Design a protein around this ligand. Sequence first.
Ligand SMILES: Nc1ncnc2c1ncn2[C@@H]1O[C@H](COP(=O)(O)OP(=O)(O)O)[C@@H](O)[C@H]1O
Lengths: 99, 1144
Amino acid sequence: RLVIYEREAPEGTVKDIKEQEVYMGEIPLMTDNGTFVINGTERVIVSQLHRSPGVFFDSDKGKTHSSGKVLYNARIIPYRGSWLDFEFDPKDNLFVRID
Amino acid sequence: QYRYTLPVKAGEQRLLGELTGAACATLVAEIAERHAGPVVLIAPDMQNALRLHDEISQFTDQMVMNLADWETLPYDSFSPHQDIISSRLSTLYQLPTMQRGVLIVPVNTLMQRVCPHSFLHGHALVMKKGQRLSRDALRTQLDSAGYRHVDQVMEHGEYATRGALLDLFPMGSELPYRLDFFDDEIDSLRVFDVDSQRTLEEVEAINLLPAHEFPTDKAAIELFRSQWRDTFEVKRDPEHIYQQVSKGTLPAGIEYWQPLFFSEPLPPLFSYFPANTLLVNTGDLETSAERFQADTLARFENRGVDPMRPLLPPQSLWLRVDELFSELKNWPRVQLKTEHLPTKAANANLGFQKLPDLAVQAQQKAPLDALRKFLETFDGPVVFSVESEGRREALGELLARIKIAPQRIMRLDEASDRGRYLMIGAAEHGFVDTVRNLALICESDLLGERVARRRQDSRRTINPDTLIRNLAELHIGQPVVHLEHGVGRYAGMTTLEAGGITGEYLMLTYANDAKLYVPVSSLHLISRYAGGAEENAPLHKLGGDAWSRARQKAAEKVRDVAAELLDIYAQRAAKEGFAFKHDREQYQLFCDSFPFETTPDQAQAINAVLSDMCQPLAMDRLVCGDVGFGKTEVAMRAAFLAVDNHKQVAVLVPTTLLAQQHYDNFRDRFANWPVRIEMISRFRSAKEQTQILAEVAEGKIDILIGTHKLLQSDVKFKDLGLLIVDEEHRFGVRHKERIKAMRANVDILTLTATPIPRTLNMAMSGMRDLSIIATPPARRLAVKTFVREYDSMVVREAILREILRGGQVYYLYNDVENIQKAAERLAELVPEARIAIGHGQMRERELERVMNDFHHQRFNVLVCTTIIETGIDIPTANTIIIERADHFGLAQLHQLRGRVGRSHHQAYAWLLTPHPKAMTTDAQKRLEAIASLEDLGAGFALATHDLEIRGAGELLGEEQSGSMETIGFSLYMELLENAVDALKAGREPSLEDLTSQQTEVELRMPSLLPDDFIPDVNTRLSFYKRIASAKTENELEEIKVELIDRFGLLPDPARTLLDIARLRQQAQKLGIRKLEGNEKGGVIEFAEKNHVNPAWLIGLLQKQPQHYRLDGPTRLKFIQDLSERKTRIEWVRQFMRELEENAI
DNA sequence: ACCGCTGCAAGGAATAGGATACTTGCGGGCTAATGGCGGCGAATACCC
Ligand SMILES: Nc1ncnc2c1ncn2[C@@H]1O[C@H](COP(=O)(O)OP(=O)(O)O)[C@@H](O)[C@H]1O
């Protein structure tokens, strides 16, 4: 449904509005069992398990800089967008990196 | 007596008013002519300044200058182009003492501060012979500069002063100069030796201008570094400005780090004003200074970031506004403004009433009614103020229509009580000075309406009873007309949301059940049906978008090219070209007419032209080079050599405009020799065409210029000896060789800017000559060029950088359907630009209006298609913005880069790109090529980039660009020479005249011999020879059966060919000379001595007027639905069979 | 009274508009990576 604002009137008014059944895309249909028939072959999408978006605190357990020093770090992981990381210098700093 | 006294006081203001357009210029001309002292006009903006810069010289005679402003933006990243700086300081050198003269500076400059005068009066020297100055004065000025008295000067920092003669050895040059002061005046400028003390050169004015406005040496560098370490902080970076200048080299915007290069406070240029100077004002300062300062600050904290190149606060690089208005109380000041102040002292309003409505139009029967009714009732003198000389004649016959006589005067004071005069100048607007009843009328005071026309809106006048008078009791299912779209079936009222506004609407169903919901408010667009067919009403489809109608399926190859190209090439290589004759002194007297000196490469290009012209061979020379490098005078010297041998030079260009400049160039250069030079285009009338082209056969016109009109199969040169063709990369192949088809051994010279790949490759493969040119005579600019992504603020700052320079912008979009929308899209992006629209599809009068108003600076930015590619003047345009450089041919990319420039001003060129991975790979190769080469002389290698990315086209066909898997060049040469000796084997008539003697038998039907039937082009060629030379049906059939014998069956193109030849036999047998046919019918044109039965032809006409009409005496238009070409052939066959049965 | 001059009818003439067919270019549609370790140069910044 398309809205057209008439130019003569102030900001937000209706000249006219149209509507029609546009067609877009041919989405596959799952069968009654689980199968998506793609090209005469019979594919199945498997459920993916991935690391949940959110915020996690982690530490490489002293494998870096050899002092016995554990380096805590924080991740903010979006479902869609840019990542965000904080971490620790062995000299007891906080360091932010992006992407 | 004058009209008004002047401000002569420390800080008095003089208010002057009642001022309309262009009156202020002659007012300040009066000011300069009445004040013994300087006049500095402060301008509100560059544009008006530059406009006033040619205004004031129109009205008076004093020397008038701008101050060259830095061209850049505040805190920009660009050098101010040292040459401009060299102009800037130079004026600034003489600014402390300049007695008479007018200087126009803008508030952009006047708010800027300048050098502290220590550097200028120390580290620079301009000195002219007419400077009355003494000996010890210049001696102590050299002492104050710090120089040493050595009486045998050899070292920088030395000068001599013995008796009257003074010598100087500067910081700038390696040479000392002898001065020889006499009578408190300078009387020699003698460039004498470092040791031998004798003069090299006698000079009048010595120009030792510093290479910069700022000190540049070492002590300046550590002073600057001291200042930077005091102010900013230095970071370890090999691009940071501190380290960059510490290496001695310079970045672009370095001058905007001004004050660190002195360690003094900087003067506001008021220090450079003379003793009693008179400042005159225009518009106001009290507005423009504010928003300039606001822009200045806003830009400063816009770039008050970025430790890479930090900036000084603007308080050092500029005055503040209050600081200005304080220093503007230090000078006697004049304020001119465009209204009526009432009454006070130091104030006057002078009668400068704006002109009445004087305008022309073709709509009225007598166009000059306002002028013809104004002039007899204007009691005073009348002045006409034409800009151009030739445009003067555009007024000359124009007022001759109202029978009114212009006299050419020079001075505005030359007015009598009542007399009509023309003034050559640079005004833009007129007025009446009612003090003396004087009237000045500009040319632009005639054409006030730049207006379009409206259309449509038919049913809004249909207020009939079918409108239903907004009954609002309409039933569902009523077929209802809605005047923009058509008829639908009304299906009720419905509420819908619309973006925070709920509403009630009338749902209406069109075809393909597309709903349309008009508001209940605007119910008056909605009308009841009128046809009375409520249950038989149609339905419109909404939108009417029938683009789908661009699908597929067009055929080609209606006419072969390859055989004919091979034919003309063989004919050229068979005969011998003309050995021209050269006269030393006669050519030298023509060289004398050239008021310039040839660059050496240009000379040897000219020499290679003549030393190929005078040979038994045929000339075929590419004279490729960049635009503006002096190509035309090469053709001048070529044509003169050609024309004195009486050889009828023919000139070809691919547009009317280039022909128009060429007519001026040819006529003005050939101003002393008995040669008649003319042009032809569509702009010439037919009655002029019918004598020019006829006279070409007679031939007293020796030089003829034109568009494709020459190649219209009617132009008959009596002795063609020279073809010159300009702006090559057009013209296909057929138009290129269609002229050479007339004369096999004609000499061809082809000028170009960037040659097309085909003619580049054929030239580089030894078939045609090549002569490249470089090294332009004037030091032109390589207008910096960029290829960046599309960015709303990047284009904005580009537009701003151009407009606060003062010139104009070519902004090209190249899509006419949306250029109207793109206009406001740019316009609220830059609200202070002035935008007009121009493209090739307007009504062919508003376009010229737009371009002439552009030519008179009435607006700044022009949105356009590639109409500007035709190469117009107006060098004030200095910035190209190609919005979508994705889809544009690289040769005309170079051509559009040639459009800006044409000036000592540094032009700019931004090539907007889309996102790099979105575009075509070929577009990326094009843009990398154009980003690689930004110089002069780079046009040709850019054409080598045009080739080898597209493939140079087929050597024996059309399609100049393309890979195409062509004929190999070695095989090409073999086929060529085989055609050559087979041609000269027994003097075989050229195929082209077999075209001419053949009756016109065109039928819009594919008639040729296809390549699969005969691969060998010589064999197909000689078969063409044998069929068109065959004069009996017996021999036609023998050739046909021989073809069948040689290659199997006979395909349809061959069959159609052979029966058209059969038709040609009886066409030439009867006298049926011109036969055109098509789908719709066609024209049979007979001879004057024809074999037509006249009474029987009238019988045809009176039995079928629908299929026989004599439109002319022998022109028979027959109208037949010739859907099948076989039926077309048999129709014409049986028709001439009827005519030979009635032949007499 | 009768050419002399003017105002209008016409007729042709010229010119805009809107068709057609020809060239250059070139694209658009369309068929035909943020779950890893190690070496090494770069790039340091770092103390001398
Ligand atoms: N040898 C020369 N010395 C000085 N000026 C020249 C010389 N040759 C050309 N010019 C200048 O350059 C311009 C020549 O351009 P022209 O050959 O007419 O066409 P294009 O602009 O395509 O080169 C002229 O305006 C002329 O003033």
